[PDB]
Protein: protein (penicillopepsin)
Organism: Penicillium janthinellum
Amino acid sequence: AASGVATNTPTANDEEYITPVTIGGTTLNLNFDTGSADLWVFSTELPASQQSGHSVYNPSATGKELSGYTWSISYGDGSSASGNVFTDSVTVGGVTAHGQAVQAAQQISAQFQQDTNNDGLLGLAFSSINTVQPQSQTTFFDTVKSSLAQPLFAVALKHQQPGVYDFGFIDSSKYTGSLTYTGVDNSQGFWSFNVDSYTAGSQSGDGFSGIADTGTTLLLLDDSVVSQYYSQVSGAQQDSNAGGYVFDCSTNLPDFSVSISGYTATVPGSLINYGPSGDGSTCLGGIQSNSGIGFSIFGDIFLKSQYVVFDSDGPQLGFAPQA
Ligand SMILES: COC(=O)[C@H](Cc1ccccc1)OP(=O)(O)[C@H](CC(C)C)NC(=O)[C@H](CC(N)=O)NC(=O)[C@@H](NC(=O)CC(C)C)C(C)C
Ligand SMILES: *[C@H]1O[C@H](CO)[C@@H](O)[C@H](O)[C@@H]1O
Ligand SMILES: *[C@H]1O[C@H](CO)[C@H](O)[C@H](O)[C@@H]1O
């Protein structure tokens, strides 16, 4: 049976996490994304100027076209990418997926044109929302999961330290105490779970649903919850140059917790200071608005507090405080 450890590294301020992936013998640095289901890469089909600063996939060297197949994906922040499809050998953490669909980029939006930190994305959401047309393809995980010792993966994302993606096994040294599991709703292709209640510092409220999303930087919550949280942060104000609510970097931030099948998942206030806001001299908050979508995005700010098991049996999510 197979298993492996893929090492992730955060970019500056932990904006995204990058993990090396070998595709047909070329290693690319990809953004592992439990919020989407596409494995797409910068490729030799992009204009040369857009290849600069990246490792790129050359499908002609090792890939096998999926004849007449295309892909086009659009993400929450407005970014997008599109192209055509080849199958190839894809190795993550020493685990090789043979005949894995690799989505070669022909077009990339401005955001990807300005991010030289990654060479594309490796989706880890359910394969049902893979965007390949006319028939969707399986993610790296779904391709290999019956070959793994257990059909799961697990993630430790850290603040300014390398972390792990564990494929096919649970590393019990990555958390304190025992895991608490909660059922997953995969009906929209996400690792969606329910929280029974929340605590935003000195205030608490009713539950909601959200998705475990390694591809999103922040913890995105309902505006009511954001407002409740920052009402407790002295001098907090919206700064559109920075991305949302900002505050003095020396601020002692309240904790944020959620109730998950009787387990309290707590994000310490220290992790809710995302980093210098950029423009001037404030820091950006790790909690921000979900734009009114009616569910929450449990992005990297939250994940840095937990070890999280993504188990296809169920499916279910397992949580415990990171160690
Ligand atoms: C259709 O699904 C997706 O796009 C999923 C899930 C989602 C659900 C509901 C709403 C938004 C997103 O998002 P994702 O995690 O695959 C996707 C991947 C990214 C590389 C583009 N992330 C995002 O779109 C999110 C925003 C979001 N959720 O609306 N993007 C980010 O967090 C971006 N972060 C910043 O700009 C940093 C700044 C916030 C300090 C990104 C560069 C990583
Ligand atoms: C993950 O699990 C497999 C199966 O036991 C091992 O072979 C591998 O070394 C790693 O521990
Ligand atoms: C990724 O790298 C880190 C340290 O180099 C981990 O220890 C893993 O085993 C992977 O090799």
